Amino acid sequence: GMTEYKLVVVGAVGVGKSALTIQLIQNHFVDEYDPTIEDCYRKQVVIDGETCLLDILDTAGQEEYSAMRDQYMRTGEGFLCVFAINNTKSFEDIHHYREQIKRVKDSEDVPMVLVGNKSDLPSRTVDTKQAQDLARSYGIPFIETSAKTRQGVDDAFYTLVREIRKHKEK
Ligand SMILES: Nc1nc2c(ncn2[C@@H]2O[C@H](COP(=O)(O)OP(=O)(O)O)[C@@H](O)[C@H]2O)c(=O)[nH]1
Ligand SMILES: *Sc1ccc(F)c(F)c1
Ligand SMILES: [Mg+2]
């Protein structure tokens, strides 16, 4: 089979995890997608000339059993840590997600990309400089996206694949 990357999209409810994922997969923007639905998507793409399969888990937070969260964190190779630029709490929540993924994988070397979504809105509580500072402290890229306009969306996902590649070649 073609090379396969397992990606997991995490972050506070309402930040745009579903909208980002559906924009990547189906190239349209979804105004309303039930906040409580968690689903694994598949999409064949070409990244740096490489035909590959993306398995993307669009997460929805708490699970029936915490075992289920741990399972997808161990399976996942890379994580999109998403906040919304007009939501400070969602930015603060990033610390929790960073910690929890490292904790479950018991690793200090977990491919991640920090994503500030909703960049199309003038309304902004988290400046680029603040987000850049956090990503720098993690040693990971920061990308601003808009699931609505599509800006930055392929970059967010493809960068995460490239981060996974760097980990795997070690
Ligand atoms: N303006 C704007 N709205 C967005 C963007 N991404 C998501 N939304 C809206 O934010 C709300 C929550 O998005 P959703 O994808 O369901 O967030 P999730 O809970 O993280 O899965 C929905 O009403 C979306 O239409 C974006 O990039 N720009
Ligand atoms: S689509 C998917 C399901 C589970 C998982 F851990 C992933 F990384 C992707
Ligand atoms: Mg959702």
Side-chain angles (χ1 to χ4, degrees):
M2 66 183 58
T3 1
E4 184 161 346
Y5 300 98
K6 305 183 181 201
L7 318 182
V8 178
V9 186
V10 307
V13 65
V15 297
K17 299 182 300 293
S18 295
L20 286 168
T21 304
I22 294 166
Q23 193 52 280
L24 195 281
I25 309 303
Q26 302 168 355
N27 286 264
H28 61 101
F29 173 63
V30 175
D31 283 300
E32 191 161 356
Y33 180 90
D34 190 322
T36 64
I37 295 169
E38 170 170 299
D39 204 29
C40 173
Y41 293 85
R42 281 148 191 101
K43 178 62 181 279
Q44 173 179 318
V45 296
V46 177
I47 301 176
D48 302 312
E50 177 185 272
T51 288
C52 60
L53 179 67
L54 305 191
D55 305 314
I56 304 182
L57 180 63
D58 177 30
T59 70
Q62 301 285 335
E63 305 280 4
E64 190 191 356
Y65 305 103
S66 70
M68 297 162 63
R69 171 204 68 210
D70 293 357
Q71 180 79 7
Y72 75 63
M73 285 182 176
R74 293 200 194 87
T75 295
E77 295 172 298
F79 299 78
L80 276 202
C81 295
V82 183
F83 69 96
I85 64 149
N86 62 345
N87 196 281
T88 298
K89 179 57 165 53
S90 79
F91 182 70
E92 288 164 350
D93 288 350
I94 295 293
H95 300 101
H96 168 65
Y97 293 108
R98 173 72 170 184
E99 158 198 281
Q100 186 173 63
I101 295 163
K102 290 175 58 172
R103 191 158 284 174
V104 170
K105 298 184 78 59
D106 195 18
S107 177
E108 305 181 307
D109 188 18
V110 185
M112 301 194 196
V113 169
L114 182 69
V115 176
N117 188 47
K118 307 211 182 179
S119 75
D120 57 283
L121 307 174
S123 188
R124 168 187 293 270
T125 63
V126 186
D127 281 8
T128 300
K129 174 180 167 70
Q130 311 165 229
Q132 285 170 331
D133 171 271
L134 184 58
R136 181 179 67 245
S137 79
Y138 288 165
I140 68 177
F142 170 61
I143 298 171
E144 284 196 357
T145 61
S146 177
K148 185 177 176 181
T149 72
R150 194 131 219 302
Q151 182 164 292
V153 171
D154 287 335
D155 192 30
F157 284 98
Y158 293 6
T159 293
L160 180 56
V161 163
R162 293 169 184 128
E163 290 291 289
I164 293 168
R165 288 177 180 162
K166 277 287 194 182
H167 182 251
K168 290 176 78 193
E169 79 177 346
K170 291 194 170 179

